[model samples]
Target chain A: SAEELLRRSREYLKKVALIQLVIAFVFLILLILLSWRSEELIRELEEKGAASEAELARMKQQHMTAYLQAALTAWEIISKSVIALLLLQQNQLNLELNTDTDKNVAEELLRRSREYLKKVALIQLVIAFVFLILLILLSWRSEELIRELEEKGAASEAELARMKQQHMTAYLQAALTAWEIISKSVIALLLLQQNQLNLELRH
Target chain B: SAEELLRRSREYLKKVALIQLVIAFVFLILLILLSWRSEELIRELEEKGAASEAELARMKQQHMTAYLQAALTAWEIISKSVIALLLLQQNQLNLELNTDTDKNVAEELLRRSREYLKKVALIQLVIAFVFLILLILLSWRSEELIRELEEKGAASEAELARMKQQHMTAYLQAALTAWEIISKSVIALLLLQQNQLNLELRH
Candidate 1:
């Protein structure tokens, strides 16, 4: 009776592993597909334009589109790679289970699996650092804009004032608002992903 | 002769793994340290302001500082967690190698090492998607802003013209430029990291 109970649980151990691996795998596949669909929707919406100042207005909008398009393209490749990695991981698990309910070969499956984890951890930290770099850039740029204004504010000139006029009002709530919207959007994105990635990184 | 070479290579294998892991571990520790120092510099720089248009100008700028401060704090937590996780990974590796230049127990070490890889892969993917979401929000917000402008342009009015007067000119090359600079920064960040992450993600 004792021997039978131990055997039954060992069988279920691999079953649970199989279940966890497959569930995570399929979910990733679907996420990549869904992400592609969302990308298309974003593109269509971005194409919509406005009238006089409208020409200048509509043109800069495209910059946001192009920048993001490039960013999204990079991600497409990454997502596909994740799927392939998962496939290998799943394949290894299946091979070990089928051949090794015996033990030694199952242990071998895990050795390859260990290497996979190292690669995965490296990839996550790499993303985290880049996000860190981005915030640095924004912080720097904001200060740069402010510094330029003060030197002139104290110095005060009429001709320079006109160019300052052109630069000045552009700090309009709209410009600030656009940056605000974009930065806040970036912030929201970073906070959430950081939490999830950290969870996944540790334990 | 072949046996000697085989023995030498086997010894070198753990040495190489040790070198790789420790090199990576220390670099991460230094990076986190450098990042904290950089944060202080950014804070000091952000405190500097612009004056009429100056007061209005400097005020909105703080919004950028605050958003990024929060983003940086999250990274601090994450950087620390990564350090702890790597410490455990290193400890496990050392334990196996020290006790088992003899053999059987070393294999057991590889078994625990395998679980660490799974967590790392999950964390990396989580960061990737949030970045993807940020691009989506930017794309959506730009479109929304454009739509609102178009409806009013076609309709036309004087009182509306005055607020539009207030709102309209902001699409300046400056507003757009600021948005351009900030978006470009984000794009640069995402692309570089995506390449590294994908490289790390795959074989």
Candidate 2:
């Protein structure tokens, strides 16, 4: 009965060892695949990040150019407004200089000059307002871009961390698997050695 | 002879088991340490990223405001030039209307007004050039900022990828360690069991 038990224990140890080894090998293969996938994901993220950065650069340049052009146009309108005001002042001064000046002619010139100045001033104001609105909109859009970029950065970091966590989990599983194999084999060996001792003692 | 061999084998099995368990426990503690450190590193990176993004946003706003103010100043200079030109024109018109007027007085006024116009136009031209230079410098600086931001972003991604590699290495090491423990234990058990079977057969 004892010999039969010893034989069965030896067979059980062999079978369990085979099964555990097979399981461990499969786990190792899966871990390798997981690592490869992680590498690919990170590489993909890197390429996308570069493309987005280039796009942002192009946008910044475009907005800056547009703002500069608006500034130039505003200055042109302001210069014209100044010229119109000068014409109005000239007509008024000419009327004052001649006491015998025809009232109708002087009045007509003065009236027309005043109208021109008013239109010029209105045009300048409108252009300034337009430029102001453009600048405000540009600022708002850039702010949104910055916010979006920051969010993307954060999301990427989070993904990396998640990957790290998965890697750590794999490591823990491996360690536990190692512990199981070690403890089980050692216990089985101890039992077999003890059984041999009992047999020897009986003899 | 068998009794002495069995005793020694029992002693060896007990000793190895104790030693292996101690080593496994120590490895577990080290694994915990590694995980804690990884989490801390990721958190630190996140904070630094947010801070850099905020700094970039502030730089953009400041530069934009400066450009707007420079544009306003340029418009003011151009308006002043228009006023000076108007003064010069007025003097000429007065002279033509008063042919009998004091020629020296009118001539002096015309000369001074013309000089004033030249100086004002020159000042406006200089200011325009200065604004152009300022805009060019701004564009260059903003481009530099964008480039710097892009480089930093790339560097960060590189660092993250490196960290992921390290994590994978750790996982591989864990797997290798597991395989070592499993294979060694299985081999040791197989040898001990075969030895017992030999002894039993001899008896």
Candidate 3:
């Protein structure tokens, strides 16, 4: 029954939301650990950086001497990385959602109208990105990747490189599609609910 | 007519999807350029890192002599950064959408049953995240940040730190909620459509 399905999907969502919170904490602890180490490294490296600043300050007690003189330097880099992250995350979301076709949604979709599949697809993508967010965190929980880099000094540098590498693109494109994924799922469920009610009315 | 509203929301989604692609390209080009610069800096830093490995290799003409021996060093670091990145993005998404109030959606929302506002909020969060993705890319396109980083050596490191800092949190939480935002919007719109049709039938 459509009513039964609605009951289940709604239940599924609330449960998923709770699970999201639980995993969020685990991700938080792990994040704090990473930032703590990075902060320590920053202190060591920037001690020199500070000397450069202090030396320059003695030279002028000045700062905009920096941004004023060199406004464009990092701007392009920042633009690019941000763009990359934005695009990549979204693309990954799409790819992720599109691939997730065990789709009881798809199965149910086939049983219904073919006219709405594309419509359903667009709506479907939204559902899973959060779930992917959860799993991506789990993958990161791969404490082992960190240990491999920890074998020596310049740890963050290697860490940075791996970050760059891991981002080679599209593995998580599906993650980006997660929202759509859910949208499709719920939309399908929704239409089914709507259609089911209509079926009763017609009968 | 409620049918009019349905037409507009559906049109709104389709048009928005198209616009997403246009911005996506601008992001991609800038991102490639950023990666190029960051790539060069990585080469310079890793040079010393490589020498350290090579010299160590001479001591044993070996490698696993490394990770096989010491593990657990950077695992924590990687875990933290990835987690922080994930949490911040989601939170920022929610924050971003939550603040976007002109809510014609909400205005229309007010005329509807109150029972659904809480329900609507859950679904509402989904819609705006994509729009935010578009804007976030626009912000990244700021160009000045990249130019600032480009003016010097160790460019990637500075960019990296800024990346870490820009991530202080919550600007995009609304974005995370985008899917929900849309869901709420569409759901609200959907119910109204249904209610309108029912009114005609009752009449």
Q: Which predicted model would earn the best DockQ?
A: 2
The TM-score of candidate 3 is 0.27
Q: Positional deviation of B182 in candidate 1, in angstroms?
A: 26
Model 1, residue B65: C-alpha shift (Å): 11
Q: List the lowest-lDDT window of 10 residues for candidate 2 chain A.
A: A91-100
Model 3 residue A37 lDDT?
A: 48
Q: Per-residue CA lDDT of candidate 1, range A49-92, in tens?
A: 21222222222333332333333333333433443344434443
- Among all windows of 10 consecutive residues in model 2 chain B, the one with the lowest summed lDDT is B194-203
Predicted complexes: DockQ each: 0.02, 0.03, 0.02
TM-score of each: 0.29, 0.27, 0.27
Q: Clashing residue pairs, candidate 1? A: A117-B117, B51-B54, B51-B55
What does the lDDT read for residue A16 in candidate 1? Answer: 38
Model 3 docking tier (incorrect/acceptable/medium/high): incorrect
Alpha-carbon RMSD of each model = 18.4, 48.7, 21.9
Model 3 interface RMSD, in angstroms? 13.8
Q: How many residue pairs collide in each prediction?
A: 3, 0, 97
lDDT at position A45, candidate 1:
39
